[PDB]
Design a protein around this nucleic acid. Structure first.
Ligand code: ZN
Ligand code: ZN
Ligand code: ZN
Ligand code: ZN
Lengths: 89, 89
DNA sequence: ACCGGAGGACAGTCCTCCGG
DNA sequence: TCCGGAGGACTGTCCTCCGG
């Protein structure tokens, strides 16, 4: 089943043979089969672990700071910004 | 297709007839077909939105509580109590 | 009666690779 | 060449209701 890295990236049929394969072989490229990427399980128990801890950190957050701040953090991607937020106390 | 509240809790086969079904007519029972109860979507995109929020709060709380059992706190249910606690900031 | 879990239709993923 | 998105095997859900 697994297509080689390059065929994946390019989205063309892979011959998939061993070691290399038609277009990496032909075209002159180093053909690889990368490991599947580890992702979190998409189960319902796990979505619920995570929604319900996020909820409880939100509940605790609100005893400490205003709701308007909740909404800012819940969007920040930068670690300086998450820290500065906290520094304006 | 939908089974009745009761056949649902008792786990027996439901006749499904409306308004009152098999048993619920028999045992002269309060027969409800309660509406289809919502869950949040199990999709990858939504698992991931929620995991990004949780990470950001998780990070914000590493700085509020650099010292431990945040989990102790996360389990409490009382608002006064939690706030009595935190005022040991 | 009661309820753990089998059974199965279905929701939605997460791959490959076709074709504009 | 290139990538949107179709195709479709599959993972895991989430019902019902069997039979112990
Ligand atoms: Zn290939
Ligand atoms: Zn290759
Ligand atoms: Zn019924
Ligand atoms: Zn009924």
């Amino acid at each position: 089943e697994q297509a080689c890295d390059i065929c994946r990236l390019k989205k063309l049929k892979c011959s998939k043979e061993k070691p290399k394969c038609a277009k990496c072989l032909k075209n002159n490229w180093e053909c690889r089969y990368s490991p599947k990427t580890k992702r979190s399980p998409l189960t319902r128990a796990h979505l619920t672990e995570v929604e319900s801890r996020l909820e409880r950190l939100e509940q605790l957050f609100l005893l400490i700071f205003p709701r308007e701040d909740l909404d800012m953090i819940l969007k920040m991607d930068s670690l300086q910004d998450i820290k500065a937020l906290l520094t304006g106390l």
